[PDB]
Write a protein that binds this ligand. Sequence first.
Ligand SMILES: O=c1nc[nH]c2ccccc12
Ligand code: NI
Ligand code: NI
Length: 330
Amino acid sequence: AGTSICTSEEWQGLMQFTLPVRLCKEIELFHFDIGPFENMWPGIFVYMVHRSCGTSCFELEKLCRFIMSVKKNYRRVPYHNWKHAVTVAHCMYAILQNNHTLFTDLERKGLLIACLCHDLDHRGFSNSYLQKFDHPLAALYSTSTMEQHHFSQTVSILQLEGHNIFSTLSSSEYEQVLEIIRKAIIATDLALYFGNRKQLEEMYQTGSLNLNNQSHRDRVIGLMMTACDLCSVTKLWPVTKLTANDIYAEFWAEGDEMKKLGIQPIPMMDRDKKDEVPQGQLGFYNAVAIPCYTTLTQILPPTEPLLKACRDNLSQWEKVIRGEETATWI
Ligand SMILES: O=c1nc[nH]c2ccccc12
Ligand code: NI
Ligand code: NI
């Protein structure tokens, strides 16, 4: 109930944070894993905003309040949590740095913020669950249920006293950035990804794709959002595998709830069906991850390292299926 707000100690502490020098080099790379640096995550976000958008893009005090209140409105769920938000924001930073001038200043600031905010107040339940069991959110938001909630949460935090990082935009640019953010967060609905990628593939292959066309820009940004949301599949294998344990911890808890309501969950959400996980992962990479990064690489060639890493992880799941897996820690 209500929107959580950071403390004075929290945001003032962020303001004084300085990123260790060695990490400045590492943060630029697609495969960077934020995992080992938890105390530094808010600072890493400030650093990325400052590098992409400039140190004077946002008033520093409002930006630090905003970041620390965003962290406070992520729940302690296994996967859709603060760590995931910062991971997704980092992937976007890397895509933006490698493609910088294709995107306006307004788009870069909008997209980094959209990524940090894109799963705000996630409860560890899927759209499927909310709609199957008629949660009040599914009544309010008929499609893209949680994603409409995450956008609503973003706006609530911006409306907190001293948190509106966008207030200094002209009235026109302010409207435009909120629309960039809305569209980007909605695009993180994987249901919408399938159609979007298919459209982009056709536009690309026929040569009609045109980034001066707003609807085309919106779709390309959409695919960037999917690519950043899924980027656990682009890390080194041990990182990908550990993250998969977290994703499934969520899935299994939802499936347990469905059993209580008399419905057998899909095998993916069934903790009694863990043997099906490797084939499930193969299916996800073949149907979602590989096509995403394939199309993204066609449109934005500098993103190729994401595709290469995804392909490497696909091969790892294939090794699991063939029984070739080696020692793992969790
Ligand atoms: O939804 C997912 N299902 C399987 N693997 C994933 C990996 C990363 C993000 C989402 C997923
Ligand atoms: Ni989401
Ligand atoms: Ni997400």
